[PDB]
Amino acid sequence: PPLLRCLVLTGFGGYDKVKLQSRPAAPPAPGPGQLTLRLRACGLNFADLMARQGLYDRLPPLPVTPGMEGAGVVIAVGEGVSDRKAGDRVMVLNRSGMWQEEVTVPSVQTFLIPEAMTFEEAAALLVNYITAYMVLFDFGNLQPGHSVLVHMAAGGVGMAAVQLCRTVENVTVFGTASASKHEALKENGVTHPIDYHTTDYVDEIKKISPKGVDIVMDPLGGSDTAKGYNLLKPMGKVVTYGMANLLTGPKRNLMWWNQFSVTALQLLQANRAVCGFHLGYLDGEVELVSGVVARLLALYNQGHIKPHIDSVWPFEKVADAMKQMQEKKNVGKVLLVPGP
Amino acid sequence: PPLLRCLVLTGFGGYDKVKLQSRPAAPPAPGPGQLTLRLRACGLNFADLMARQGLYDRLPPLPVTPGMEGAGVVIAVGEGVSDRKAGDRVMVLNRSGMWQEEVTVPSVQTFLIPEAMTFEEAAALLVNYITAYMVLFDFGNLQPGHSVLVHMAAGGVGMAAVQLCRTVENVTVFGTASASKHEALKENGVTHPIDYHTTDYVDEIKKISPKGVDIVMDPLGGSDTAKGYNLLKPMGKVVTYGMANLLTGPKRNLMALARTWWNQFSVTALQLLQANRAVCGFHLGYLDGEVELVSGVVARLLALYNQGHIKPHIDSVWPFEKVADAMKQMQEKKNVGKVLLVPGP
């Protein structure tokens, strides 16, 4: 059968909203500035779960193919495209459409993969490590001697942040994950693993550092964000980049009053900083993202970062992939493949 | 009868509340770790104008001698102090007490003045340049190719920030001040001068850079803070370090419970997350006690000075008896650079 497979989001809601639909195998004809490519692997992000629940404000109208990060092979390029050609391995960063067999994207949103890196590391590199880099360095301005709190240090962005913190001299890493992963945390580079499930991490951090930490990374959101503000040392920065507490909390069917708010004078008198980052709402900045991608690839070629994979799932098991992240059962990156 | 002169803030209100008093010149006896020194010059900041109207929460109870930075000669060394000796030219950064002829301060809060540097430039260096360095780099994370909005670019902190931006390559600096000072801006390193009194600086910036700027420095506060938030590029940071919008009407006491919520910019976590901006707050007055941080910053600043990369510009120096004429000089925003104080007539 000369058909292509695609994952489509017909409605907003639970895991069942992602359906497998067919398409008429057609000859690739990307327009000017475009690029048709077949996908080898796809990444699963928390922004994907936010979009599936309807909380991505820049999502195209339904029905639409989900997926924001992919990795595959260029099959064709349109007129005016000289930086890319057929057969090149590329990492794609988009707003939607990455969870299918074949996709046509703007060539500006693709980046060539260096050799010796598999597609699995490539699909596990873009979103997580770009977010960790831009949170730690662009906003957090990570320096030697600093102290960092990394929430969900076992997750993809968490492990990425731990590895990136190991690149800076004398960085105290506070990692939060289940006790079953604590050992692995110390393997990943975490200095003090803390289990937020049994005890309150604020006191566990205050007993080791009474004044707090320099940087706080908050993919949790809600109440924890407030906590992250009060754990800040002078010149400290709390950077929120996710809503894990919303999708991992007791209400996995959302219906939060714990939204943190601050005034300008409160920050002026506390000498603290609040930051918001989300790669989905950032595209359009050519140099801003290209420099980060280049520095990440250079760090990779020096053997200093290596995306770890937790599990790979076919399209037919996309649900089993998403729940794998929803119940926080993943150690690494959850991937999708368009395989039978 | 040799006596020492002091400036004492006796009440909250107009310029008349800061009065010049005197005391007997007792022999200097600094305690352990202390240092007694006679001040040649003292720096006037906007925090002092806030304190005179009661807006400086960390100010000691009245009556108190205000002033955060001074520059003079060490006259007595307390016990345990070995890095300092008599005759040393030092600039000192404290929370209060610097508007007088003699001070006994912790030696760890003083720094040796370079020989090629005058006392006036020394008393004009610490507060403004420390604020500019920590705003642009610690919070703003200034990088080459960035764009910075420097409000009150003719002020002390503003000129310090412009000089500090000129050390990073290809930094476009937007400065807002009245036209009468625009010339002084362009030589200092401002790329696009803007008159906030005759033009709307937001759209004036957007005409040159439609996506905004990378860093915003807000000494104005209030509604302007909100504007600084809406001029931020992706990954942009707005750093508030003053409340110049409130410091009009120098004769009233500005303490109010409504200072906490009225015209106060507020933001939520999701609002910052959906955008790609950050909101920062800084105030050196609410920051003392951490000597290692500030000492590293001061060492870097003195290196930059000796390399000819920064130059403290002086607007005017005033005797103590004209402290009022000093304060209005900064309160009416007629100064280009630093307004200083000198003890003697």
Side-chain angles (χ1 to χ4, degrees), chain A residues 1-73 75-254 258-340, chain B:
Chain A
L3 43 78
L4 301 163
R5 302 151 46 194
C6 34
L7 282 183
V8 189
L9 184 71
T10 56
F12 293 133
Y15 69 96
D16 53 331
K17 303 311 175 189
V18 188
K19 312 209 179 66
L20 176 56
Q21 298 195 353
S22 94
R23 208 162 84 193
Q34 290 301 109
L35 188 147
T36 306
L37 73 146
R38 292 287 183 108
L39 280 143
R40 289 263 201 273
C42 321
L44 201 145
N45 303 114
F46 273 97
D48 298 314
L49 306 178
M50 297 287 287
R52 183 200 69 184
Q53 228 76 17
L55 294 175
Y56 189 50
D57 295 11
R58 303 195 181 183
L59 185 79
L62 304 183
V64 72
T65 290
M68 298 185 183
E69 49 170 345
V73 169
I75 296 299
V77 175
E79 259 174 349
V81 175
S82 178
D83 56 308
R84 308 276 188 270
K85 52 178 297 178
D88 278 330
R89 312 186 316 139
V90 292
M91 271 157 329
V92 184
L93 181 45
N94 204 24
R95 312 205 156 160
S96 57
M98 300 304 103
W99 290 2
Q100 44 188 327
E101 278 197 336
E102 183 177 309
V103 66
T104 302
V105 296
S107 188
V108 202
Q109 297 282 125
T110 75
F111 314 98
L112 300 165
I113 311 179
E115 27 193 49
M117 176 198 274
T118 184
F119 288 104
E120 301 164 359
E121 300 157 314
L125 177 82
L126 277 198
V127 173
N128 297 352
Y129 279 82
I130 279 174
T131 296
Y133 184 93
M134 299 192 116
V135 160
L136 283 170
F137 300 117
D138 282 346
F139 271 152
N141 198 11
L142 178 60
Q143 307 294 327
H146 267 183
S147 311
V148 192
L149 166 60
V150 180
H151 281 298
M152 306 166 77
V157 184
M159 298 185 69
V162 170
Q163 296 177 16
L164 290 179
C165 288
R166 295 231 310 134
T167 76
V168 187
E169 200 94 40
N170 296 12
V171 172
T172 303
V173 174
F174 290 88
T176 72
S178 303
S180 63
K181 311 166 179 176
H182 275 187
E183 290 210 306
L185 280 194
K186 198 139 305 308
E187 172 272 323
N188 194 229
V190 178
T191 314
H192 306 112
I194 296 182
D195 198 333
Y196 46 53
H197 289 132
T198 79
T199 172
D200 162 80
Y201 57 89
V202 181
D203 287 90
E204 286 300 321
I205 293 178
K206 286 292 193 175
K207 73 161 53 56
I208 296 187
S209 166
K211 292 307 141 187
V213 303
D214 307 86
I215 305 181
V216 167
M217 300 180 58
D218 173 58
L220 309 182
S223 84
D224 289 345
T225 297
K227 306 188 180 71
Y229 175 74
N230 292 127
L231 278 172
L232 282 184
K233 286 192 277 184
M235 314 310 296
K237 298 99 171 183
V238 47
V239 192
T240 167
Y241 53 95
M243 288 280 283
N245 274 345
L246 179 76
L247 294 154
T248 64
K251 299 302 159 295
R252 272 197 268 272
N253 315 326
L254 328 169
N258 277 316
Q259 274 310 299
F260 182 70
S261 90
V262 73
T263 51
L265 214 82
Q266 183 181 353
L267 294 174
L268 185 144
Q269 297 205 0
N271 284 278
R272 299 179 174 174
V274 287
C275 328
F277 175 83
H278 207 276
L279 190 54
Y281 305 96
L282 196 64
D283 280 295
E285 288 289 306
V286 300
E287 319 289 341
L288 184 85
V289 193
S290 280
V292 174
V293 170
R295 298 195 189 110
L296 278 184
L297 290 187
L299 264 52
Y300 178 79
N301 298 324
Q302 274 104 64
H304 291 170
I305 62 178
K306 201 209 72 171
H308 180 56
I309 312 301
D310 172 76
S311 54
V312 181
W313 308 82
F315 278 1
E316 311 85 46
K317 293 191 180 60
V318 52
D320 304 297
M322 299 194 289
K323 277 162 289 186
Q324 185 73 15
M325 180 196 262
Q326 284 212 256
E327 284 122 6
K328 298 197 297 295
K329 295 183 300 180
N330 61 282
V331 180
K333 178 77 165 204
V334 185
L335 291 179
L336 267 67
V337 283
Chain B
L3 281 68
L4 300 169
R5 323 152 88 235
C6 312
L7 281 185
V8 183
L9 176 65
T10 56
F12 294 135
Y15 309 117
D16 43 329
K17 296 311 176 197
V18 178
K19 312 200 176 68
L20 168 63
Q21 304 184 2
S22 305
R23 94 176 137 88
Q34 281 186 338
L35 259 189
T36 307
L37 63 153
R38 298 286 186 84
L39 297 196
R40 301 278 188 263
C42 322
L44 198 131
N45 307 285
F46 276 94
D48 308 321
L49 310 174
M50 295 158 38
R52 200 199 68 247
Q53 300 208 238
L55 293 185
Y56 186 44
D57 283 358
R58 305 301 278 265
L59 183 74
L62 301 189
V64 73
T65 290
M68 285 177 45
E69 52 178 335
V73 181
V74 166
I75 75 167
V77 178
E79 188 197 55
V81 176
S82 49
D83 57 328
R84 305 276 186 270
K85 56 172 178 298
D88 294 3
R89 308 160 79 245
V90 294
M91 33 181 164
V92 50
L93 173 65
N94 209 23
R95 208 72 74 88
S96 67
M98 296 299 104
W99 288 8
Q100 58 182 317
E101 208 162 3
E102 190 186 79
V103 279
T104 298
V105 290
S107 168
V108 84
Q109 300 183 215
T110 72
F111 310 91
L112 298 172
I113 298 176
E115 189 50 65
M117 189 197 290
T118 70
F119 285 111
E120 294 168 14
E121 293 158 312
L125 180 83
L126 288 185
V127 165
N128 294 157
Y129 284 80
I130 281 169
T131 312
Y133 187 96
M134 304 208 63
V135 157
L136 291 167
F137 297 113
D138 206 325
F139 275 148
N141 195 16
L142 180 65
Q143 308 292 330
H146 275 186
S147 45
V148 182
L149 168 55
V150 184
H151 287 299
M152 271 200 56
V157 53
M159 292 195 71
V162 174
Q163 295 177 12
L164 287 184
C165 275
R166 251 194 164 165
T167 81
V168 188
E169 294 303 319
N170 190 28
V171 177
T172 302
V173 180
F174 295 84
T176 67
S178 65
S180 60
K181 311 166 184 169
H182 277 193
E183 299 146 322
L185 269 55
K186 305 222 71 176
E187 212 286 325
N188 204 35
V190 181
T191 309
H192 309 285
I194 296 184
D195 195 335
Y196 51 40
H197 286 136
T198 68
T199 64
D200 164 62
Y201 61 90
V202 165
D203 278 297
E204 291 290 351
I205 287 163
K206 292 257 164 178
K207 287 180 189 177
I208 303 171
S209 173
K211 46 181 184 173
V213 302
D214 293 297
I215 302 182
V216 169
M217 304 179 59
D218 174 43
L220 314 177
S223 315
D224 285 318
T225 299
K227 296 184 183 175
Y229 175 81
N230 295 124
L231 271 174
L232 283 184
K233 277 196 273 181
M235 309 311 293
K237 306 96 168 178
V238 46
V239 198
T240 312
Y241 57 102
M243 51 190 75
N245 274 330
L246 286 176
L247 298 167
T248 80
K251 317 194 175 190
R252 217 171 179 90
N253 176 12
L254 297 166
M255 314 153 107
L257 184 66
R259 297 273 84 86
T260 61
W261 58 267
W262 191 77
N263 212 21
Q264 275 305 306
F265 184 62
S266 174
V267 76
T268 74
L270 280 186
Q271 185 174 5
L272 291 179
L273 187 136
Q274 292 210 259
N276 280 275
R277 302 165 175 173
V279 175
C280 309
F282 180 85
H283 203 281
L284 193 50
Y286 299 81
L287 194 76
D288 282 75
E290 287 76 10
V291 187
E292 313 88 326
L293 169 48
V294 190
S295 65
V297 173
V298 164
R300 184 111 57 172
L301 285 172
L302 287 180
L304 277 175
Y305 178 79
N306 288 321
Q307 296 179 4
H309 299 165
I310 57 181
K311 39 150 289 291
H313 183 243
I314 313 295
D315 173 67
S316 54
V317 317
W318 308 72
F320 281 174
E321 57 260 49
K322 308 308 174 185
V323 53
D325 298 316
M327 293 189 278
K328 61 98 184 153
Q329 170 73 8
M330 186 173 287
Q331 285 217 215
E332 298 167 2
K333 302 190 220 304
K334 289 304 113 212
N335 62 291
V336 176
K338 184 83 175 178
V339 183
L340 292 170
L341 282 169
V342 292

